[PDB]
Ligand binder design. Structure first.
Ligand code: CYC
Lengths: 159, 50
């Protein structure tokens, strides 16, 4: 939240506002809890990714259908690696407080990419929604609100 | 000959704690703080509390 506040006060000619300095103070105060949430999500990488991908294949069997993109062991391994990448970017966004790491690493040009790869966008989005549900079940309650709202940004930005 | 001031009679107050009405508002607000969802721990343990 420091980069966004600095560039927002950079667009104007003035310094950082007292409101924005309160935002940075509150972000520092919540930063240790955010590191705890990142600790839990780092250590639960395997089973979260596998449960979310298998929930996706329960919801959407078109990708693992033989006409689909994720047909075969190697293709489905790359599917789970894509879900791993998005969970990693979600942890980065939970730590930073911005969504600029999520955005400029994995959001900004993903539609044209998955159009050229032949992969449907909505199934990626359903898999990240499954990640949101799984990480919501793992964490503490309003902590899961925090994690699932960054997950919610990723889900709404993919579609 | 009679004693002028024998002692000091202790006098009781006419307000104990029921007034002072945000000590009293705090009794209420905090008594009702206990039974509102308290989101700090997982959510599944907090639907099963009577
Ligand atoms: C960190 C940001 C980031 C993303 C998102 C990313 C995706 C990505 N997905 C790929 C393939 C793939 N991606 C999928 C994805 C899916 N199967 C489905 O049906 C679902 C909708 C979806 C799972 C979410 C599949 C099936 C392939 C293999 C397609 C192919 O090999 O042609 C490839 C090419 C092979 C590779 O290098 O792994 C990239 C680069 N790369 C990145 O750096």
């Amino acid at each position: 939240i420091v980069t966004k506040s600095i560039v927002n006060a950079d667009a104007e000619a003035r310094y950082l506002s007292p409101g924005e300095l309160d935002r940075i103070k509150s972000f520092v105060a919540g930063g240790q809890q955010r590191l705890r949430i990142a600790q839990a999500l780092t250590d639960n990488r395997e089973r979260l990714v596998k449960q979310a991908g298998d929930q996706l294949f329960q919801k959407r069997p078109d990708v693992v259908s033989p006409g689909g993109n994720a047909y075969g062991q190697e293709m489905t391994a790359t599917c789970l690696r894509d879900l791993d990448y998005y969970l990693r970017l979600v942890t980065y966004g939970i730590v930073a407080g911005d969504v600029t790491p999520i955005e400029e690493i994995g959001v900004i040009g993903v539609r044209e990419m998955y159009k050229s790869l032949g992969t449907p966008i909505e199934a990626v989005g359903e898999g990240v929604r499954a990640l949101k549900n799984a990480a919501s079940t793992l964490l503490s309650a309003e902590d899961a609100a925090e994690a699932g709202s960054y997950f919610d940004y990723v889900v709404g930005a993919l579609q | 000959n009679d004693v002028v001031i024998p002692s000091f009679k202790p006098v009781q107050a006419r307000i104990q704690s029921d007034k002072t009405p945000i000590l009293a508002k705090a009794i209420a607000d905090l008594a009702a703080q206990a039974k509102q969802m308290d989101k700090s721990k997982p959510l599944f343990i907090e639907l099963g509390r009577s």
